[PDB]
Design a protein around this motif. Sequence first.
Motif, PDB file in Angstrom:
ATOM      1  N   UNK A   1     -10.456  32.364  33.601  1.00 60.71           N
ATOM      2  CA  UNK A   1     -10.126  33.553  32.829  1.00 60.71           C
ATOM      3  C   UNK A   1      -9.612  33.123  31.462  1.00 60.71           C
ATOM      4  N   UNK A   2      -9.537  34.092  30.553  1.00 64.36           N
ATOM      5  CA  UNK A   2      -9.062  33.826  29.204  1.00 64.36           C
ATOM      6  C   UNK A   2      -7.588  33.433  29.212  1.00 64.36           C
ATOM      7  N   UNK A   3      -7.223  32.567  28.264  1.00 64.11           N
ATOM      8  CA  UNK A   3      -5.841  32.107  28.154  1.00 64.11           C
ATOM      9  C   UNK A   3      -4.914  33.255  27.764  1.00 64.11           C
ATOM     10  N   UNK A   4      -5.428  34.249  27.034  1.00 66.25           N
ATOM     11  CA  UNK A   4      -4.603  35.392  26.656  1.00 66.25           C
ATOM     12  C   UNK A   4      -4.140  36.171  27.880  1.00 66.25           C
ATOM     13  N   UNK A   5      -5.040  36.394  28.839  1.00 66.07           N
ATOM     14  CA  UNK A   5      -4.675  37.143  30.038  1.00 66.07           C
ATOM     15  C   UNK A   5      -3.615  36.405  30.847  1.00 66.07           C
ATOM     16  N   UNK A   6      -3.767  35.087  31.002  1.00 64.98           N
ATOM     17  CA  UNK A   6      -2.772  34.307  31.732  1.00 64.98           C
ATOM     18  C   UNK A   6      -1.430  34.309  31.012  1.00 64.98           C
ATOM     19  N   UNK A   7      -1.450  34.187  29.682  1.00 64.87           N
ATOM     20  CA  UNK A   7      -0.206  34.230  28.920  1.00 64.87           C
ATOM     21  C   UNK A   7       0.486  35.579  29.075  1.00 64.87           C
TER      22      UNK A   7
ATOM     23  N   UNK B   1       0.154  37.653  31.622  1.00 66.11           N
ATOM     24  CA  UNK B   1       0.650  37.743  32.992  1.00 66.11           C
ATOM     25  C   UNK B   1       1.959  36.983  33.153  1.00 66.11           C
ATOM     26  N   UNK B   2       2.038  35.772  32.591  1.00 68.13           N
ATOM     27  CA  UNK B   2       3.275  35.001  32.676  1.00 68.13           C
ATOM     28  C   UNK B   2       4.406  35.689  31.924  1.00 68.13           C
ATOM     29  N   UNK B   3       4.108  36.264  30.754  1.00 71.49           N
ATOM     30  CA  UNK B   3       5.132  36.993  30.014  1.00 71.49           C
ATOM     31  C   UNK B   3       5.640  38.191  30.807  1.00 71.49           C
TER      32      UNK B   3
END
Lengths: 339, 56, 17, 283, 231, 217
Positions: B21-27, B29-31
């Motif tokens: 998945x895109x790094x933006x989505x993971x970032x 989600x973590x935020x």
Amino acid sequence: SELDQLRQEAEQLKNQIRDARKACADATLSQITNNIDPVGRIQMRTRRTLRGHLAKIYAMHWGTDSRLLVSASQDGKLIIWDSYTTNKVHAIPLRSSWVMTCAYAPSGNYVACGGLDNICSIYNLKTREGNVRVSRELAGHTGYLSCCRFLDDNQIVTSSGDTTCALWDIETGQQTTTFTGHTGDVMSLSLAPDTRLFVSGACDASAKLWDVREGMCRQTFTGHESDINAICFFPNGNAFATGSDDATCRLFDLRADQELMTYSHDNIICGITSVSFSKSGRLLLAGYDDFNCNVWDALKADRAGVLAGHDNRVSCLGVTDDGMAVATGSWDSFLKIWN
Amino acid sequence: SIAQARKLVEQLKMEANIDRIKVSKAAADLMAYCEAHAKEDPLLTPVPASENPFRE
Amino acid sequence: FDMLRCMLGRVYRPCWQ
Amino acid sequence: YINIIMPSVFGTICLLGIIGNSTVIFAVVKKSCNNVPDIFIINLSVVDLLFLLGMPFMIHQLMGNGVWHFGETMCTLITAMDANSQFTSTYILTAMAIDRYLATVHPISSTKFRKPSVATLVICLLWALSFISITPVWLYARLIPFPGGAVGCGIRLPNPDTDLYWFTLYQFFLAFALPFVVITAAYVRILQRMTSSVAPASQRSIRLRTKRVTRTAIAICLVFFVCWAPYYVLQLTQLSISRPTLTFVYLYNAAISLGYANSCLNPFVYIVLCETFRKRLVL
Amino acid sequence: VQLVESGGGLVQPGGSRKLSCSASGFAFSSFGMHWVRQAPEKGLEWVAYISSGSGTIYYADTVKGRFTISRDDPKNTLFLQMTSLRSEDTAMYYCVRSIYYYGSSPFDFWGQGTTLTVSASADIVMTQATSSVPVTPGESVSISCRSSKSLLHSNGNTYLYWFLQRPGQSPQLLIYRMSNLASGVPDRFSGSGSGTAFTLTISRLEAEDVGVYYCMHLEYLTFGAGTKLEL
Amino acid sequence: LSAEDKAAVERSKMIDRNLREDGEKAAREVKLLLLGAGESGKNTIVKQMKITGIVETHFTFKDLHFKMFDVGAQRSERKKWIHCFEGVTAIIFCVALSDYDLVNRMHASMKLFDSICNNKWFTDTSIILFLNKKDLFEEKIKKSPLTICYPEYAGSNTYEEAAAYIQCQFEDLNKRKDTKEIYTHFTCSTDTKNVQFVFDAVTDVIIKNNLKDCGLF
């Protein structure tokens, strides 16, 4: 076929993986989270101090009850410390004085120790006779032990210096599953909250994610450039941060298979020995070779605070399940509890 | 020998067969996960000594 | 200001008797 | 003038002793103890600190109008405290010399009769021996109004001009006769029986270690001798005299200053001659 | 884990006697020990306690000075010498092991005991009422106890113990600290309390639990009156 | 205050007393480490000083307990566990004399000695150097010149000069001559000749440590 053809195919696969990773990245974590209000300065004091050991402490693990922690030192004694009352619940005399890893079972019935000797001994703390006994001795490894951590009362994953990890069975004393994907000797181990996958870091500057049931490396990360000595799993379970010897800590994630961001500073030049996460995951407490310990802002890569209560090399750092306090262990035979 | 190279190539292919998945989505989600469990964390926000078991 | 008595053991002894 | 030479040197000696003792105390407490040499050095440091704290009363009894401002009750307490501090200081010094001799000459057998458990016991025994040795001073030290107009403390004893022999000889033989020869013999035996069968040959490390040990032993012996010997030799010579000559008083004051200088710069000798201590000083 | 008692028998009043306990199968050095006296018709009574390091020796109010207790770690034998006995001490004694640490279960094992016959305040009082409670197999029976002083310590742990003594058998620990179940007992046993009134509940009762229940540890160890279940 | 925690405190004090006794016993006991090249004679010196992972051999000589560690079965990264041996009293390094022409083996032994002597974790420990297979070296030196291994050896082809040059070359590798010792010894088939040298080196190091602690040196 020929070695050259297989090497070319592997290079092509690595190039394809790198292209997929690069094309799947659009926005960095720092620029996404810059809008977050800063954490600010954090002050922590030594609520408790432990001075029962007489040698260099190499490992320390927190029990699931958030009250008892086990410490290992080269003197050959494992001490189960009472955090609240500063008491020694048990003293474990080791047959081999060389120990560099210890673990506490989630149920609290058993503890594990290991070191230069290739055995991760299991001790039973609930014996009817009232004294601890060696329940099992796992002697299937060929290299020095690095970290064996419990999964239940019958299973434990052991990482040794023979570049291979194992899934031991306590009842039978045999390696149920062996992981042989690493090229360098494994140093640190960490488990996911769901206890289905685990990631291990070796000295080949790479961290690999493994499956407990199936038993193969699903993903590997090569974002570092030196040896890896520490690794920890995010409480969410979709990311993990690991330390290294080049004064850099990198936070990787599993669902994107790339490095989100790195934590480093020009002042810091020594490596990282221990990495642990808080309950929220906002604070990343990473050990270092020098006497102090640093607290990092996970989403902003900022120096939240410094823990400089020790006077020697910090070896083991851990955060309890409820996040009430943080325990730091060093080579000065002193264990300190911060809050 | 060639067995190790063959198994390494198979491992690389199996790793490349996964989805990302895109790094933006993971970032994001973590935020979101970090921000959700913010007040209840006893380390990011100091706890008063009344509820602190480690108070001196 | 003109003390020139007999001293013994960090203290002044009663001198000759 | 000639009346402002003694108090300046006494004050600077006291200040040097205070700063040296404070530095040694801070270094030892920051080091932590479980080490016998650490216990011995910390006890010597606190004894020297007490001695320097008791020194100003003796100095005021000497400098000024020659009047003991404090009461007769404080007379005996102050003199007993000062004499006890001097006797237990020399006892700690000779005990440390004996401990070093045991550690060096006997590297294997000394592990039995050692450890802080025995160190504290021997410290208490030395303190008790000092108390016993200063017990005669407690009997004495009644205020003596010899000048008439003023009063100064004196150690007047029964059968005067006859107990001077016994008291002076007892103090000499218990302070600068037995401890000095014991320390000298211990250091000589340490120097003679270093190394082991010339196994490490005569490389640079052995030469440096031998030179450093010799220098430390010679410095300790010289410090303990050059300062204390004039005081007791003057106290012995005054046994056969009745009146001073306007110069023996100055010599006695100089001898007291030398003794205080010994008690003050003993920690300085320990700090300078030890490379580990100097390395620890930088942090 | 075995505790063999010896030294009983008929003794004339005003004499002296020696009680010996043999311990095997467990580390006797690191285990504190207790002596419990039970009258032929009354309940359990505490006598004395000795720690692992043979220090901090405690005696009962009517036992202090008159009796002495010592232990021999190399010999694995406990000695309780009694002098100037009277007609009030005609009872059988018990020897109880107990180790004290975080999560420990003191008073877990009780000895068989030996019978002894003699020929012719400011302490927490446990009443527990309920002299007799008729029961029926398969039903649920509740046992209630009361304490004069609140047992809820400032550390959050309430020190309460429940003991079951089957007829012609040594007492066994069921629940310690009123919330933790002892090892080796069925899970049907449950305990609860509010610091003053304590309740013991048994679910799916059978014939193996017929006996007398005893209740107690804040200060030095009064027992309860004893609740007897009749089948 | 406490109600039942008093017994816990007493147990903790007992554990502390036992730990102090064990620590004093361990400190009273000398600690030794073994290292060197492959097949250098470690299995021979083990038989000389009569008693998988680390092999520990314990023996008491002249009322002095010796702990000896052999690390030759660990084919892992040495720097990841070399710091675990920091604080050992002495290190025994064994090099076979009759290995100057075995290809380079002497060069490998010199490299290992330089790596272990200059290591940052052993800047103060003493090194005991043992030279094994002396008889084989004496037999070989007659037929094979020492210039094969060391081309700059401008000397005779006798045993004494060759042994002196070997000892000098091995000692020259130490760049920490200020406060370090190298106890070079030639092994002998007769018993009580190697253990005696080990005891002498150990007691010399003990004297040095005692002098350092006392502040004399």
